[PDB]
Every structure is written in structure tokens, then in C-alpha cells.
């Protein structure tokens, strides 16, 4: 990976942007350049092939420069369904092979602020039977992307057996994240209430469940 | 209009040997102007050239990877095939089967204009489990759901009445136990009339074990 991206570039809406991709003459310098867009979560596509050339189907709104021993995409008139991973692609005659640039995260600001909104779901009794207790806490449709989650059981904490997943982006730029409490069918029938915190920019709400 | 899809194995034991099959449709390897290429992607990391075979038996194979890597195809059939020999963890990835378009001449014009789904592939010594479905129930709407629990290794895939059912269905990715087991949870918001008469039933689909399990999720 010689082709040198920016990890992250950010953007308000309506505003251009631009992602540089720096390598030598071996590559970029002589080579051409091609340009692919890869939303959250999904395959890659391409924007930009021979330095400058748009497919069809591509907005305009895009474009590529080339100029020395770096290339650059520029976004014109940024919207929120822009935010996507960026990587360039170009031959290298020294290195005698085909490299991408590390890649280059696109965030998009305008969005409204989202609180979470989250869904608990007690043991079944499926899995009662089997001696086993999880309890499933689902965090979804937030904006900005950062929660924290906490476990209570009665009044104490937990810590023991909570796995969180990290924040995804969903299909509509929001985020999504999921918490699990795994415990034995003794465990869950021994306290009075169990309940998921989760703590998204400044105020805390709670979810709660019991036997 | 032109697909691609890509065939393997989910999960591969260390230094094993990968091999992956290409199937296309939609245009020829037999044009003066395409090639086939397989990119693969480390979880959250970036795009990485493999391998290219093109129409004339060219070959631009990754120099770093040479002595691991080899390609072959079968213009008339419409298939190429890829082989990663010795397997590490750290070769788990996403692999994608491409079209390479280019001019005659141009001087390296190639780009890849064309993507498969790509094929999540996961090098481990951990071995094949399924999960155990588990149904996820209880003033306007009401949220249903699915526990899909304990499974190795991804992917997973979840529908609602046989697929019927899209709306309002949000299947969350996968939690990562320190069991080295993986879970995930698919929900769907329902009206909350509705339950009394329209019946719920979540598919969970899990290949790399065969399984595929139907479960009724009432109250």
C-alpha cells in the first residue's frame, strides 16, 4: 500500500470535497488511476477509471484529477448517501503489480441528532429449558454513532457475561448496535429485574425486564 | 447486464490450501478486452489485488503473494479459479470475483467494472457449529424477534415468512463471544394488531453448517 490515503475525511452537506491519493511515478505517475466507492457494509463499485472517466450511471458529481505523483477525487455538492470507503487502484512498474490505496472514510455531518431507541427481550422458554438465560438488548436507529451500555441487575451492576457489539452505520446513516447477557436459567430466576442502559450523547435511558 | 458469483469454503483449517471458483455470466473471457480478478478485504481494512487471468492467458498475479497464489481458467465455461496454499488467520477475509475491462494499448487502462458478492472466508482451527434459534416476543406497534445463538463461522442470513415479509425487518450484525462463538439477533416491528392473526416466522439460514432452522415466534 505505497498509495498514501487520508484514513478519514469529513464534510457538511452541499459542500466539495476532495480525496488525495499519493504514490510515485512507478504507479501513479505513468499508470492510470481508477476510483471505487464501497458504502457501509457492501461491495465495492466504480467511480472513476483512466484518471478522469466516469461509467454510466455515476453522478456527476464526482471526478478525478490526476496531476505529478498523486491523484484526487473530488465530491461536489456532498450529500449523506456519499458516506462510503474510498480507495484508488493503479498499476506499479516497479513493484510489477496492481495496489490500492488504504482506503479513505467519508462522514457526512448534516444529519439530525437520533436518540436510540431500545428494545429488551427476556429469555425464552425454549432456551429456559435447556438451563440457559439470554438476555438480548437491541440498540437502533441513532445518530451520532456512540452509546454506551450498561447492565443492571436489581440494583447492583453486571459485568460478567455482557458482550456489546461496536456501532454500525445502517442503510439510512443512522447506527445500529446490539448487547447480550448470557446466563444460566438460575441466574435470571435468582434476581428481581435485569435492565439495559444505554447512554447516547448525555441522557441515559433504560429498558427493563423480569421472570 | 453482467453477474458474477463467487464458490468456496466458509471456513478453512491453518496452512490448508483456499480455493476459490468464479462463475460468470453476462459477457465472454474469450474478448480481446476483459479479464477475471479476485480482490479480497480483511475485516475493516483495505481492498487487496489477488490475482488476474485474462482473455490471451495473461497472467498479473500479487508479487507478494506469488508463491502462495496460482490461476487458472475456462473461457467456455465461464469459470475461473483461484488457489491461496499454507492458510493463515490473518488471510481471513472477503473475496470478490471481478471483470477487468482495458483498452488494447493504453498502457495499464484496467479497472474493475464488475463485482461478485464476495465470499467471506475464514481461517480457523475452530470448528463448524450451528446455532440454536430462539424466539424473541413480549401499545401502537409491537417488536418480534429471533435469537440466533451460538455459531461458527459467519455468515448467517434471516427472512421472515419465507421472505415474504420485508418490512420492518432489521437484522442486527453479530456479536463475537470469548467462546470464540458468534450470535446475532434479527427483529421486526409489527403492528400490534396484528398478532392476533398474522403468523411469525423468522428463516435462519447458516451454510457453512447446513442448517436452517423455521421458528414460530408467539406470546
Known amino acids: 500500500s505505497v498509495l498514501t490515503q487520508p484514513p478519514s475525511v469529513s464534510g457538511a452537506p452541499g459542500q466539495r470535497v476532495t480525496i488525495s491519493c499519493a504514490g510515485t511515478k512507478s504507479n501513479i505517475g505513468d499508470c492510470s488511476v481508477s476510483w471505487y466507492q464501497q458504502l457501509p457494509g457492501a461491495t465495492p463499485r466504480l467511480l472513476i477509471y483512466?484518471?478522469?472517466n466516469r461509467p454510466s450511471g455515476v453522478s456527476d458529481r464526482f471526478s478525478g484529477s490526476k496531476s505529478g505523483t498523486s491523484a484526487s477525487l473530488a465530491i461536489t455538492g456532498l450529500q449523506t448517501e456519499d458516506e462510503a470507503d474510498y480507495f484508488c487502484?493503479?498499476?506499479?512498474?516497479?513493484?510489477?503489480?496492481?495496489?490500492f490505496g488504504g482506503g479513505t472514510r467519508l462522514t457526512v455531518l448534516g444529519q439530525p441528532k437520533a436518540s436510540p431507541t431500545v428494545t429488551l427481550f427476556p429469555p425464552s422458554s425454549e432456551e429456559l429449558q435447556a438451563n440457559k438465560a439470554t438476555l438480548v438488548c437491541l440498540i437502533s436507529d441513532f445518530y451520532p454513532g456512540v452509546v454506551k451500555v450498561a447492565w443492571k441487575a436489581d440494583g447492583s451492576a453486571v459485568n460478567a457475561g455482557v458482550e456489546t457489539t461496536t456501532p454500525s452505520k445502517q442503510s439510512n446513516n443512522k447506527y445500529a448496535a446490539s448487547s447480550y447477557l448470557s446466563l444460566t436459567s438460575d441466574q435470571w430466576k435468582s434476581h428481581k429485574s435485569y435492565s439495559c442502559q444505554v447512554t447516547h450523547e448525555g441522557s441515559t435511558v433504560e429498558k427493563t425486564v423480569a421472570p | 447486464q453482467v453477474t458474477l458469483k463467487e464458490f468456496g469454503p466458509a471456513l478453512v483449517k491453518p496452512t490448508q490450501p483456499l480455493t476459490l471458483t468464479c462463475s460468470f455470466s453476462?459477457?465472454?473471457?474469450?474478448?480481446?478486452?476483459?479479464?477475471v480478478v479476485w480482490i479480497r478485504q480483511p475485516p475493516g481494512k483495505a481492498l487487496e489485488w489477488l490475482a488476474a487471468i485474462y482473455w490471451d492467458d495473461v497472467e498479473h498475479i500479487n508479487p507478494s503473494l506469488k508463491s502462495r497464489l496460482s490461476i487458472s481458467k475456462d473461457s467456455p465455461n465461464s469459470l475461473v479459479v483461484l488457489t491461496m496454499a499454507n492458510m493463515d488467520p490473518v488471510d481471513t477475509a472477503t473475496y470478490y470475483c471481478?471483470?477487468?475491462?482495458?483498452?488494447?494499448?493504453?498502457?495499464?487502462?484496467?479497472?474493475?467494472?464488475?463485482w461478485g458478492p464476495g465470499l467471506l472466508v475464514t481461517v480457523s482451527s475452530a470448528s463448524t457449529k450451528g446455532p440454536s434459534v430462539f424466539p424473541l416476543a413480549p401499545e401502537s406497534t409491537a417488536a418480534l424477534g429471533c435469537l440466533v445463538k451460538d455459531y461458527f463461522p459467519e455468515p448467517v442470513t434471516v427472512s421472515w415468512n419465507s421472505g415474504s415479509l420485508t418490512s420492518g425487518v432489521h437484522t442486527f450484525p453479530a456479536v463475537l463471544q470469548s467462546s470464540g462463538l458468534y450470535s446475532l439477533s434479527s427483529v421486526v416491528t409489527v403492528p400490534s394488531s396484528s398478532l392476533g392473526t398474522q403468523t411469525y416466522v423468522c428463516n435462519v439460514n447458516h451454510k457453512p453448517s447446513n442448517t436452517k432452522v423455521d421458528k414460530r415466534v408467539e406470546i
Open positions: 471481478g471483470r477487468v475491462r482495458f483498452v488494447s494499448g493504453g498502457y495499464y487502462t484496467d479497472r474493475i467494472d464488475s
Open positions: 487502484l493503479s498499476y506499479d512498474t516497479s513493484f510489477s503489480g496492481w495496489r
Open positions: 483512466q484518471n478522469n
Open positions: 453476462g459477457f465472454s473471457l474469450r474478448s480481446s478486452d476483459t479479464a
